[PDB]
């Protein structure tokens, strides 16, 4: 462990060993300076024109933390498409993280001419939470994660919590933490840190989907031995009577016959369609959206309840909040238009989940009598019923592995919205901070806390590495069947690559449910 | 493994042992930073003037590449004599490769004032593609090997590599490659790299000339036993009539004797003289070429399958496109003068293979009848045939050494066209790139990627040992032989030497076909 030698080789690739797939990348990461070496209390209330649904209270920490919780980040497009057309589901098994070749740099600004030079003797610290004593950030979809290709730099994101509040103000309850209070462990120049971490059990993603829809699973050639009330008036004329009158459902009302199973749950949301001119002319983005109340708060409901995106030959349509929207490459951050945004399908769930846009069905209203025709009602909302059968939301290349599980009595299916894997011990959370170092303190005595540093930042490289596990197909399909595959016809430029200016692009979403599987 | 100690001697020798000859060369190298860390989509179509036949699409990337495919970067001027005047044939066997003695340095350029300084932290990462994985770009007489006096200092060159293309435009069987997906070893300054590498068999490679020609093989005092067919008329007078005669070749008629071979193949090319009076007054260089057409866009034959360059007492003639062509001392890139290059020659192999610049021969072109003369037409290309023999072309101390076997299911006589071993697994590429360190960050996260690094460069010193094999002569000549000698009168400079300036020269190419051999 010397200043003259390297700690750590720079290990990115990907083996595959039958049900065993290997990930590993390497990266280059830069940590600045935050908060000067401080915590600040950061709120925002009901003032201005904060509306009371968007107040918090919360601190801002002068920490950074590592993020890997997007798949680009260990799977190349090649291998993301290998795993995809091959797999009927997978999942993590392990886990292993490295920091190494560490260099810490101070830079003097000086009349304007900036010069930088090498600090031998200063540390960072680092530590993982392995007990999840800290409020858990990861898992909401934030940015900073490892860039998707190997060739770039990247910044590492500032930690910071909220907890709760009264408008602007804290409560008794609130709670402050300091980072300083963990055991951390310090590192210079020639001084490397890694640690290892096990996957609780969790089940398969379905990457796959229906070949059959719910209600078709009847023989097609043969009736039931059931009856169903077929008719309640007298097949005769003008002069119909009450009479009660039965069939057996057959080939020819499939929609009569009797079943086993029921669809999933439903949150009705708001359809709109691509086509411009066919929406209302009225900005109804916020007021007419599927929201819930909580603690006299409204919040979106983004992307809420997992329900397929439309039926068939309605591609146009979507849900106001129901899809996950990817930006494309150099995308503006606020109002920007659709050309420029890449919207997800949950399309595939079409045999099982209610369309996301229409009503569950339809229940009986009231009793019916000789004087009172009968009545039926739409139901736009459905918890869960004995029988009810659903898939979950689809993962993607560029989107979230997994999230945890809030420490509750209850719950009811723990897998996230966002779609990935619900765990209640993930992955540990990881920080990181440059050690402060007081510029020259004055020659008298002073009770005064220093404030004068020396201004200063640190880099090196980092490398995730997981073993995830298969499950491989085995179909009896005779036709062949539909694979994701690139485009055959020339264009200017190549998917996943780089222009003329070394930027990289992901030119649209990849999903993962290619193969088929009878239910 | 110390900053304050060296990683490495300098190893510069040649020793021979019998069959064996093992050579060792150091040399000192410099490595910039290319594309700043970026890699590039670089491509040209027809657009402008370029013509169809010199479009193209690739990539550039910031990785640099070591090069030792010449002969000259092993062995001095005498050891290349000491070799080609007492063997008849040698190959390679083994190779040994070291990177030592690695410093990095940056350099400030600040109002002018450049200055340069020791940054003991950083790293540099080398790795080699021992899988064949990469577009395998060695073997095409790129520039950037090893200088051939050690007292030099050289860069290394950048590293791309192109695909298939459609004018300008890509398609959907482009390829594209990251090259930091590959496990990669870091070093600091006090780290060293090598390795290994064993060769395949392959033929000796002919280091002689034929003392006999393909069509003066008989015993020229004995006749033969067969007969030809000696004239188709009456020997009489003016009232010749249809005969069928014969007779016995001998040493009178040795060009009507049977024989049991054949020349080589052919592929004819256009003649020109080093008399400028003596060629068509016109721009033919271009028009008259002999080339091939591939995929809609024509190629230049250059050098082309190995054939004599000229027949005797011709040597002001050769081939348009036949001969390989150096350039003297500190030659122009572009459209130099005829007396700044020099010309090879492969006269030697006039025993066996057909005159570049003549048909192959003559053959039959009808059926001749009594009132029908016969026809015979000329061969100007001509394939293999059962019986053939040939020589390959001949190789020089500053041409190439290998070339890698191009991976396909069939190919014919897998010799390098440009001359030297053909192999199907070449010495791997070594690729080697400086590690990005980026300037201080901002203060507030930001997605965007670095974009702002230091500007730093490295150097050290590199080895190269290979082992080859000789195949000793065993004649029983009686006369004194050819052999390569310098010249013995007085000279302004010494061949093979530095000017008043330090500047060293090579005053002419030096084959390896000068000892003889019986057919």
Not at 97 to 123: D, R
Not at 125 to 149: I, K, N, R, W
Request: a neutral charge; glycine letters at 8%.
């Amino acid at each position: 462990d010397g200043v003259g030698s390297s700690s750590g080789n720079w290990h990115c690739d990907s083996t595959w060993l039958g049900d065993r797939v290997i990930t590993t990348s390497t990266r280059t990461w830069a940590l600045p300076t935050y908060n000067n070496h401080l915590y600040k209390q950061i709120s925002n209330g009901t003032s201005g024109g904060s509306t009371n649904d968007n107040t918090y209270f919360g601190y801002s920490t002068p920490w950074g933390y590592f993020d890997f919780n997007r798949f680009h980040c260990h799977f190349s497009p090649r291998d993301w498409q290998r795993l995809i057309n091959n797999n009927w589901g997978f999942r993590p098994k392990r886990l292993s993280f490295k920091l190494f070749n560490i260099q810490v740099k101070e830079v003097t600004q000086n009349e304007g001419t900036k010069t930088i030079a090498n600090n031998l003797t200063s540390t960072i610290q680092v530590f993982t939470d392995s007990e999840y004593q800290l409020p858990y950030v990861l898992g909401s979809a934030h940015q900073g994660c490892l860039p998707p290709f190997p060739a770039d730099v990247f910044m590492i994101p500032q930690y910071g919590y909220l907890t709760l509040n009264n408008g602007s103000q804290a409560v008794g309850r609130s709670s402050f933490y300091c980072l300083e209070y963990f055991p951390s462990q310090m590192l210079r120049t020639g001084n490397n840190f890694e640690f290892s971490y096990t996957f609780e059990d969790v089940p398969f993603h379905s990457s796959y989907a229906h070949s059959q829809s719910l209600d078709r699973l009847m023989n097609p050639l043969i009736d039931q031995y059931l009856y169903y009330l077929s008719r309640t008036q007298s097949t005769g004329g003008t002069q119909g009577t009450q009479q009660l009158l039965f069939s057996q459902a057959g080939p020819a009302n499939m929609s009569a016959q009797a079943k086993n199973w029921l669809p999933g749950p439903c949150y009705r949301q708001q359809r709109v369609s691509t086509t411009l001119s066919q929406n209302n002319n009225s900005n109804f983005a916020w007021t007419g959206a599927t929201k819930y109340h909580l603690n006299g708060r409204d919040s979106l409901v983004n992307p809420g309840v997992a329900m397929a995106t439309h039926k068939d030959d309605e591609e146009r349509f979507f849900p106001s909040s129901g899809v996950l929207m990817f930006g494309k490459q150099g995308a503006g951050r606020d109002n920007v238009d659709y050309s420029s945004v890449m919207l997800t399908s949950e399309e595939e769930i079409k045999t099982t989940n209610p369309v996301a846009t229409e009503q569950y069905g339809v229940v009986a209203d009231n009793l019916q009598q000789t004087n009172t025709g009968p009545i039926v009602g739409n139901v736009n909302s459905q918890g869960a019923l004995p029988g009810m059968v659903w898939q979950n939301r689809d993962v993607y290349l560029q989107g979230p592995i997994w999230a945890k599980i809030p420490h509750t009595d209850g719950n009811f299916h723990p897998s996230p919205l966002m779609g990935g894997f619900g765990l209640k011990h993930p992955p540990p959370q990881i920080l990181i901070k440059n050690t402060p170092v007081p510029a020259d303190p004055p020659t008298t005595f002073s009770q005064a806390k220093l404030a004068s540093f020396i201004t200063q930042y640190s880099t090196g490289q980092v490398s995730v590495e997981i073993e995830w596990e298969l499950q491989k197909e085995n179909s009896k399909r005779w036709n062949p069947e539909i694979q994701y595959t690139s485009n055959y016809y020339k264009s200017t430029n190549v998917d996943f690559a780089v222009n003329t200016e070394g930027t990289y692009s992901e030119p649209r979403p990849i999903g993962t449910r290619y193969l088929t599987r009878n239910l």
